[PDB]
Design a binder for these strands. Sequence first.
RNA 1: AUUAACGAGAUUCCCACUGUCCCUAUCUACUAUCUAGCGAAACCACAGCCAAGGGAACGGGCUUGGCAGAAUCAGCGGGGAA
RNA 2: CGUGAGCCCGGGUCGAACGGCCUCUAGUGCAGAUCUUGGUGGUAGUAGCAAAUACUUCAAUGAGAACUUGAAGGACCGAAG
RNA 3: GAGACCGAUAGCGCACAAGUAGAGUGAUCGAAAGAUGAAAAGCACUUUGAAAAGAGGGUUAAAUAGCACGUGAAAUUGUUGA
Lengths: 95, 168, 104, 385
Amino acid sequence: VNLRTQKRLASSVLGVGQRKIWLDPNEVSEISNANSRQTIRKLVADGLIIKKPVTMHSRSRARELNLARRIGRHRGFGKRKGTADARMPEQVLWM
Amino acid sequence: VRYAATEIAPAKSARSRGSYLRVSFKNTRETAQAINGWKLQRAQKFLENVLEKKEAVPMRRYAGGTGRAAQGKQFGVSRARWPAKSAEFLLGLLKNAEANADAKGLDTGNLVVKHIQVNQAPKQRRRTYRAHGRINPYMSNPCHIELILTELSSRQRGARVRRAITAA
Amino acid sequence: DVVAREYTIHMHKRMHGVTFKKRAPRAIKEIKEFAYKAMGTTDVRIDPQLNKKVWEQGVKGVAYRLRVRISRRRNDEEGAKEKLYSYVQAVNVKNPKGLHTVVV
Amino acid sequence: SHRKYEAPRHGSLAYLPRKRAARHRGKVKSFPKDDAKKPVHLTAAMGYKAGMTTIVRDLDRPGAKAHKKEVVEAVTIIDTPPMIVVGLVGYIETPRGLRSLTTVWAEHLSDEVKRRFYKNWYKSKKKAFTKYVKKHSDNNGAAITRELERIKKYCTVVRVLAHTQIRKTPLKQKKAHLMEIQINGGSVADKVEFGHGLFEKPVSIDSIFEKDEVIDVIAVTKGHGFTGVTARWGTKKLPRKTHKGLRKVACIGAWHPSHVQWTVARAGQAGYHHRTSVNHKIYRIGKGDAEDSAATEVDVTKKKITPMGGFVRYGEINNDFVMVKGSVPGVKKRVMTLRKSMFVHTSRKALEKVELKWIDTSSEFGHGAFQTPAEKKQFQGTLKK
RNA sequence: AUUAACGAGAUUCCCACUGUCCCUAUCUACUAUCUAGCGAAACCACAGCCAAGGGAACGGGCUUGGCAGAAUCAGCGGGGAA
RNA sequence: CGUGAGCCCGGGUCGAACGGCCUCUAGUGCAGAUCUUGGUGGUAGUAGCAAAUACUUCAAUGAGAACUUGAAGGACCGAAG
RNA sequence: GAGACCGAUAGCGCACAAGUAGAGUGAUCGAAAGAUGAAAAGCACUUUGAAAAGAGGGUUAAAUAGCACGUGAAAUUGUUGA
Ligand SMILES: [Mg+2]
Ligand SMILES: [Mg+2]
Ligand SMILES: [Mg+2]
Ligand SMILES: [Mg+2]
Ligand SMILES: [Mg+2]
Ligand SMILES: [Mg+2]
Ligand SMILES: [Mg+2]
Ligand SMILES: [Mg+2]
Ligand SMILES: [Mg+2]
Ligand SMILES: [Mg+2]
Ligand SMILES: [Mg+2]
Ligand SMILES: [Mg+2]
Ligand SMILES: [Mg+2]
Ligand SMILES: [Mg+2]
Ligand SMILES: [Mg+2]
Ligand SMILES: [Mg+2]
Ligand SMILES: [Mg+2]
Ligand SMILES: [Mg+2]
Ligand SMILES: [Mg+2]
Ligand SMILES: [Mg+2]
Ligand SMILES: [Mg+2]
Ligand SMILES: [Mg+2]
Ligand SMILES: [Mg+2]
Ligand SMILES: [Mg+2]
Ligand SMILES: [Mg+2]
């Protein structure tokens, strides 16, 4: 069976991309008969078509660095790349 | 439909015509030359081994710039190859001919590939695009593959008379 | 006949010098070649979980040793019915060192 | 000069054609001159290259800078299990050269010899020499006696058919290397009785060669495959601006003669050539039974010639061996032919009587610092094992 | 005529630096290589071993000699006044 | 048969017109012209199909699956995509 | 209405869905391509193949006329024979 139009229809119904659409590999025969949007959203309620969760992008490593920056860590001359005027302009300091 | 033999009576033989097949003529001519003159069962098995690279078709006429193999020692040549597409088409003809022989009642076990030839077919047209805006032909070389399965003077006279009388 | 055994494949010596981006694909091929030399069956299937185990560390990172379970089974109907096919599974062991061949 | 600045030719014209040797076992092209006064003796032997090592010895050369100082120098170790003699070949002198008149084979040839006569020994019926052994049995071996009488009366050069014992070496090969060795020495009658008595009797390397003898080593060099001009001939590399390749010869010939000549360097095969390296001095003929083969009178450690962890890619040495000075053509595991020198030696270096002082037995698999496992344990103390 | 600054402008020298070089060696990827499939083009009097002679004064063919043994694969850049 | 350009006959294929002789007539005879148009070779199963990092396992479909589809794993574009 | 004309590379560029298809921004440029048989009677049916087709069988005076169709040269190619 060919289910390219099923992932295209399911992507539009569920509001996500085609990369986040899961069609049950053990139910492709019944999925292949879902030729309409009304049938597609019926399969979603039944559970044959599932929207995958987003891939996790955690930020806590950035939070840990910012907290260490607050208490004075990772600030030496070996961690500075821009000029002092770029890191903190004297126009802002005088202002 | 007339075959190139015309001396084999189509009453104790089997035939398969084959025409306009888009397979290399040079490859199929060499594949058929190995099959020529073999038993039907040996020829069918040989072409099955060619598909699996167990034994190789010797390239004799159209073998310029090709490569050597150790499986060409069976036929005494250095250059050998495994024309899978050619051998796959010929197996279809051998199977077709053997089917016709069975329908006619011919004894399949003693059949022999006695006549097989490969003729060129009208080429097919495609283009290739070369440097500096030139265009060159990109030609196919199809073929036809027909196949038939079978299973004194007075002094001399006087000397002869004397020879018989004198000889014991 | 039907027989299953647990095998350790010293995969490190098969991947020595192999081009990166070809190591993981070749590991699949060498497992199939390993299964043939052991059970004498040219038809080797590989469990999808064992595919995950080989591809676990990307295409360049393949485990130095793999502990697999090669099980020679009987083909029922597909293709050559009388043939035997080998099914290779993954043994979920974290210490693939110091083990011998074990008949299951 | 029309060659602006001229240089000597790259390569030697005396080693052409530089092609793969027609053989894998080195061939004795010529044997010594066979003085008729000396007693009968063999003139050649076969061994297997095990590897190289280094030694220390006290030099002895009056007038040299290092006249009485210690020198470090490399040696090559050749594993030589005793050879078996299985045949006798007679040669007659004809106006067209030398011609093999007859060959005599002893009965009871081992499977190592018999494998040399097949390409598929595993599936053969092993019928070699099966009908021949009847010559030794029938008529009290009168057939063999007639052939021996022929050799004595007619032949002027007698050779024995040698045989290696490759089963005693750590090689996967089971075919033995067979060879003809010329019996230089006394009269033709003496040579036949010498060779006949040697039938089926092992011959050790001890009898053929001495400790201070200068020998020639014949083997096939290490193969390199198809290699370019710079590797084969050592020509100058071209400047980096060159368009179509740098490792090439620029001019492969003048306009006339309108041909590429045989004296111009061309890419092709390098290595795997037959070579005869001469003037090699023996340093030690070790015994395969002794447990102190590497022990000298100064280093009294009871250690064997095998380095720690074994010779790399060869194995251990459990047979007689020959320690020869310098490097020799070939690779490890390669069968090598040892032949007596065809020259006369008068140089003090050639006539020098060597006496070893220390033989290295540290591992060649790395930067090994210990010469024996016992020394490693005392230096390192105790481990977790 | 002289000129500070500027210059993917031309030139000389010095310091640093380095395979440019003495003098080359080694490694990796993609080719070349072998296989399955697909599959051109330039060029082509006929063809394709030399030496000397003569000749339109530098021959593959002629003359006199040397010689000369099926079929081929990978390179190569002397010749074909390619 | 004829010195020759050519002519005649026998054998095979083919299916509707054709020839000799005397005069008259001409868009009347090809090996070339880097001739024109069409067709076909050797080269030759040869050069080659090598930029843009990369694919693998199972199952289904099917006569046939590296480049169809689903699932799983591994990757890339990395918001001047 | 005719011809001591041409006869499908000839005769008009066009004997045919020809100033057409196609090319060029445009002015303009501009082809190739006729013939089964008296009559489609254009191969029913069986069998091998996934199929294209093949083998039998049938139509016809003829398939040595099968829509790739009157005859079917040469270049070039395959088999057999010498
Ligand atoms: Mg400011
Ligand atoms: Mg090539
Ligand atoms: Mg060539
Ligand atoms: Mg263009
Ligand atoms: Mg490597
Ligand atoms: Mg010059
Ligand atoms: Mg350049
Ligand atoms: Mg000449
Ligand atoms: Mg010429
Ligand atoms: Mg003449
Ligand atoms: Mg001549
Ligand atoms: Mg040239
Ligand atoms: Mg070149
Ligand atoms: Mg008619
Ligand atoms: Mg004219
Ligand atoms: Mg003409
Ligand atoms: Mg012409
Ligand atoms: Mg022309
Ligand atoms: Mg190629
Ligand atoms: Mg390219
Ligand atoms: Mg923007
Ligand atoms: Mg007719
Ligand atoms: Mg007709
Ligand atoms: Mg026709
Ligand atoms: Mg012809």
